[PDB]
Amino acid sequence: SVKEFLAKAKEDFLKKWENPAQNTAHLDQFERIKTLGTGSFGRVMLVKHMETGNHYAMKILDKQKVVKLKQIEHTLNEKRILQAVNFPFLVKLEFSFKDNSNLYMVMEYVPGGEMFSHLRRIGRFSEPHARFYAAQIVLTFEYLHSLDLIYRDLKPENLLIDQQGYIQVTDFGFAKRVKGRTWTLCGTPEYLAPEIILSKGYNKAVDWWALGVLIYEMAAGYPPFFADQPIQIYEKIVSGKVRFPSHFSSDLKDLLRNLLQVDLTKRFGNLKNGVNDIKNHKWFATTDWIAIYQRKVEAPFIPKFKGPGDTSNFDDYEEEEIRVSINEKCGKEFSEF
């Protein structure tokens, strides 16, 4: 039945994966309201779909900037994977399109804000609160890894909280469909597995290393490995000398020693029993895995939400008006988009 749900969700993914949705909307169907977040090539904005009055989150990416950074293929990955997945804790793509200057992905608007904001403000989450979140990621990675996807950029920044207190993963920019191994040095420094850092070739197990980082950060309020300069972060990751706060329970410490494990023959999520080694661990004993999937666990934190189009759970950003050039930019490079 876990096995039966995954074979069905696999047929549904491959259909969309082999024949991606293209050009299902246009810019002038949306009113741009406010910037919710940025990245190297643009921004995600609260928008209003004018024909329905629905709010969405629209990612805008400047194609020339994508090319100047040699990231064409990672952006195509991002859109092809996003349009094809479907799981309760993945942010759902409604539309995508492009014009002369830009790429556009209209997503579900997730009004509760980034986990990163709440984590920093509150300082840290108690163990039950972190577990609640962790369990969602464990199921999301179970789903993704079954499709042969690696996510590769897990962090509080990409984990949005929706109206009922649940997670929506965003920012699939480093997501990639890989049977076998891959070698790109990419990720967030704090979250990178040792094998990514050592240029070794890696697989989906780098996501499970990252899960250990996240849990650790959720529960302590700081990540297991940090320092002012990325190079110093990587020195500490390759040493793999983790110190735990005294408040971490002995079950948590034991989960984390098995996730933040340098040796792939011993890292949880990568072994014979795969993901079940994580679900059947003591720290998750009070976790009802089917109730998490079905959204029927009470969330420990329900965001304040004073009406649609309200953006109070997000930081403020400089706005920049969109320009659409009269000439097509980089048309062949983004032709499948």
Partner: peptide
């Protein structure tokens, strides 16, 4: 403390990814 060392660091804001 570890906490104070973190808050005093340059790494408590949003973190950007590295890449190829």
């Amino acid at each position: 403390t570890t906490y104070a060392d973190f808050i005093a660091s340059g790494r408590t804001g949003r973190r950007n990814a590295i890449h190829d």
